[PDB]
């Protein structure tokens, strides 16, 4: 499987741990499209940063 | 009007210092408890000031027996 | 003494937790759970309006029949969660019961009569515990007072009870106490 992740809100003024998790995801600038594996761990990542990202599911 | 309070002590920084499942080496301290909040187990030393440590490499393991708290070290298998 | 079933529909709640609970409460439906020897506890929604109306009409205790997708169950109310402010019902518990079984019920008691000038009215206990049948659940209790003087401690076990009920509460409990009325001197003595 695969996931399309795109940050929809800026990182500014967000909890430091959330910012670091965003870096882990690998989104530098707002509205970047990134493809990632559908693991439980990345699912948890998206769940945590859900208020900043939208998920489009591919495959 | 004047106050008679306002003095205090130092901060000894007590409390458990190696947590359950960690890997510790010989002569390593485990806890710093004023009272006997815990109790020695096999391979654990009772310090001169109610402090707990380990007398052999291994992984620390807490556990309740007879309704108290006692620390112990399981020697991790030699690779 | 026999009562009449208070039919009321109900539905199995879909979601469990604060989210669904508060959403239903805002809607106007109170979450409800029933359980018993049936070894099958499960959970449902009610209608706040009819629920409160029936509560009022039948007093603290009432024996009910429930509508579950056409299934009819008999249960007696045990515990409740009344809104501290709103006067609304948060949670009620319906305990499955069949005809011909023993249950423990707490019954309220009301007082009426005539009091003498030197008679002071006081109510230590408003409720008592009694054992009775499922279909024999009362809703009020009455005691007559006439021409009492000085110390007239009324014993809870001294009251006359209808048939089919046993006094669970020990006889040491007191229901109504009448003491000497206070005067200006006592009124000023107390509070200081």
């Amino acid at each position: 499987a695969e996931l399309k992740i795109t940050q929809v809100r800026s990182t500014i003024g967000a909890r430091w741990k959330q910012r670091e998790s965003l870096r882990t995801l690998g989104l530098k600038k707002i509205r970047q499209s990134v493809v990632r594996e559908d693991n439980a761990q990345t699912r948890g990542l998206i769940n945590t940063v859900h208020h900043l990202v939208e998920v489009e599911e591919v495959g | 009007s004047s106050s008679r309070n306002g003095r205090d002590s130092a901060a000894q920084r007590l409390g458990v210092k190696r947590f359950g499942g960690q890997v510790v080496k010989a002569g390593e301290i485990l806890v710093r408890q004023r009272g006997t909040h815990f109790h020695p187990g096999v391979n654990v030393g009772r310090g001169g000031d109610d402090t707990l440590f380990a007398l052999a490499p291994g992984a620390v393991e807490f556990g309740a027996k007879r309704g108290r708290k006692t620390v112990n070290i399981v020697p991790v298998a030699r690779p | 003494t026999a009562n009449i079933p208070n039919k009321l529909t109900a539905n199995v709640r879909t979601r469990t937790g604060k989210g669904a609970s508060r959403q239903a409460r805002r809607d106007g439906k109170v979450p409800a759970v029933l359980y018993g020897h049936g070894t099958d506890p499960q959970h449902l929604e009610l209608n706040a309006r009819d629920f409160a109306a029936v509560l009022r009409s039948h007093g603290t205790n009432a024996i009910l029949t429930l509508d579950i997708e056409g299934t009819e169950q008999l249960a007696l109310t045990k515990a409740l969660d009344v809104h501290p402010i709103r006067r609304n019902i948060q949670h009620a518990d319906l305990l499955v019961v069949q005809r011909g079984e023993k249950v423990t019920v707490e019954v309220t008691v009301l007082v009426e009569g005539d009091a003498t000038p030197g008679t002071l009215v006081t109510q230590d206990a408003n409720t008592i515990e009694i054992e009775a049948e499922a279909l024999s659940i009362p809703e009020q209790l009455t005691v007559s007072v006439e021409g009492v003087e000085a110390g007239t401690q009324i014993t809870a076990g001294q009251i006359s009870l209808p048939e089919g009920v046993n006094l669970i509460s020990d006889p040491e409990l007191l229901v109504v106490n009448v003491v000497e009325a206070p005067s200006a001197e006592a009124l000023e003595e107390e509070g200081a």
Binding site: - | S1, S3 | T60, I85, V121, N126
Partner: protein, 136 residues
């Protein structure tokens, strides 16, 4: 003039009032009682005044209760003293109250007179309140 007659220490920190009043949320003892709505302080003076208002009107019949009791102290630094230099001295005692708590409890024959007396108690109280009966 209710006051604890001895405590461990004569002053206490500022409060947290958040939370719904759980203790005594339901009338029990008498047959009628008040129920407050909003978080607030209640001074010993306020409690005593309400007690007087209830009692003196009810007169002979019935007897009252007070489910609350002002325990926690308070202080206020006298005027003309630049803030600082330690805690002030205690002035009055207060009893906390949370939404849904029951303040007073009555067992008197008549609902009308019970309501009237408790209404005067409400008017003399510092926070909103309303009548409530024993029923479920």
């Amino acid at each position: 003039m209710l006051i604890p007659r001895k405590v461990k220490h004569r002053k206490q920190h500022h409060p947290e009032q958040r939370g719904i009043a759980s203790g005594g949320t339901s009338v029990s003892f008498g047959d009628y009682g008040i129920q407050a709505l909003e978080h607030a302080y209640i001074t010993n003076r306020q409690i005593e005044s309400a007690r007087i208002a209830i009692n003196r009107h009810i007169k002979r019949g019935g007897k009252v209760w007070i489910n609350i009791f002002p325990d926690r102290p308070l202080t206020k630094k006298p005027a003309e003293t630049r803030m600082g230099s330690g805690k002030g001295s205690p002035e009055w005692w207060v009893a906390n109250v949370k939404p849904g708590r029951v303040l007073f409890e009555l067992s008197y024959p008549d609902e009308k007179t019970a309501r009237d007396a408790l209404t005067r108690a409400i008017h003399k109280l510092p926070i909103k309140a309303r009548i409530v009966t024993r029923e479920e």
